[PDB]
Amino acid sequence: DNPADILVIAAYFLLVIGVGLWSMCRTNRGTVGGYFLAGRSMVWWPVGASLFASNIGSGHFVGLAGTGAASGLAVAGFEWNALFVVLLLGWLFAPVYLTAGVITMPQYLRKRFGGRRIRLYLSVLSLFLYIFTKISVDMFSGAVFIQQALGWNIYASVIALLGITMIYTVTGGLAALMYTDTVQTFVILGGACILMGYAFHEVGGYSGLFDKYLGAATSLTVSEDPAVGNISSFCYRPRPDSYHLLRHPVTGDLPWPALLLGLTIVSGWYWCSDQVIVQRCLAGKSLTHIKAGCILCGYLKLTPMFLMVMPGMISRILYPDEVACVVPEVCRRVCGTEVGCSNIAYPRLVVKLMPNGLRGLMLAVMLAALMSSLASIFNSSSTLFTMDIYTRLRPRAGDRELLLVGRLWVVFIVVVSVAWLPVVQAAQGGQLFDYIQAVSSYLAPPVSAVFVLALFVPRVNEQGAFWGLIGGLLMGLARLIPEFSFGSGSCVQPSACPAFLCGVHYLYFAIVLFFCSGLLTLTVSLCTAPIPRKHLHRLVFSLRHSKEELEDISEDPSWARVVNLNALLMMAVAVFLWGFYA
């Protein structure tokens, strides 16, 4: 309501309109190549910024700060894992997808194994994963930030946000989104940095976070409800391993072997096997631009710890009676949610710390984060649907009808997401961030397992890859459905789940499901006919000519040398930071 907020939001919209118009003036959007792969003309800095901005949504501010507040700094693991896995994308996966000439990752599996059915299955599974794990987290976190910061109707505002991101997605294509994602990356990091600075000032520096956070307990630990009573000291006191990334392998909330192996498997899917991230690399101009873009993305993926997780922890120190509430009736008064108020952590800092002008910048940050992620998911889902499913229904389609169908899918997936909003709003507190990582850990590892065996074991055939995926889905669902039946509850009100389902961490299940999908893929492969695949195997990883029988992934040796040394430097910095906070 202060003019300065409306001017900052208007200036942000003018930047987004302006970079969109410059991209539409520059690029061709009349062809499938142009609209869905940005002409394969994207240099390193939009690749990197777009990888970053398609990944960081409103969920990363709400979820990571909230989990920061609840549980300390090991959720940085979620972000920091990405660093190493984006080097797998640029050096292992992206070369193979460039030499295969794929528009989609289901098409790569069409090329590698050859049936009609793996491509259809992986398209449809991806489309469901985007609704369950990607749209849900964005819509949920948007609605938390609006409820808490603005106070507006959380239906009308999410309809309105979805409608502007629909227009923003359909009006340009992947080329406008990737250039606009350089501006969205700038706004996100810059506003997030200014709020991090105000937050760290309020607790009295970096030292202030680490000497006040283990003390940061609420004074309201006794419920008026009988059979809740005096709340346990485990449920309101901050965890004694709060300052440690690497937590106990059995009793850790995020066990270190689950963090390292289990997230590598799930991140593998997310970064290396999944249309949303990989479409930005498929739009790379060169392999060396994809590799440089991958390093930019890894450096930016270090930034979430300091911009989101540590502000969340500062939110627990400054507002311990509101952010670290445990009494079910106090948490209903604070944030509407009986199970906790950890999700207010980030929006509380914005409300309570930002002046008249910079509140508007923090609305622009959350808008930028939410629009970039939703636009990426809508465009990628459009590509997946158009190219995979609609060319099953209409093979002699042509590049004018396929763009119409691409833009109409964005309208349909917006409508599905509006109809999905009440179901996601039924997730109560910071449970949803666990649900989305649990879903990803139950559904993604079969897909990670097939892409690894698609790229590194040329004997894996179609029967193995398909029945690996389906067996994997069956094993996934055998956990998922039992779990979602029993609920989650909370530390105060435990769920009544057996400890032979929910007892094992979902990132440990991700490990088991990966090796079991993989073992079944190899077993069924070895017990069927070896399919010489044309004889071309530019669909596989090798050092020796990456091929067999434009599509030439040879880069300049000087620029090769540069990105190869910056990847090792970027890993060394990562491993230092893993060492530092372990």
Binding site: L568, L577, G579
Partner: peptide, 29 residues
């Protein structure tokens, strides 16, 4: 001390990258 945990992690990583260059130099050529 955090700084020393960081350095020991980096040290071990530079040993593993030296091992990677050793194994591919003698076993791919």
């Amino acid at each position: 001390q955090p700084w020393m945990q960081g350095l020991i992690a980096v040290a071990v990583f530079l040993v593993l990258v030296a091992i990677a260059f050793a194994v591919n130099h003698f076993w791919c050529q």
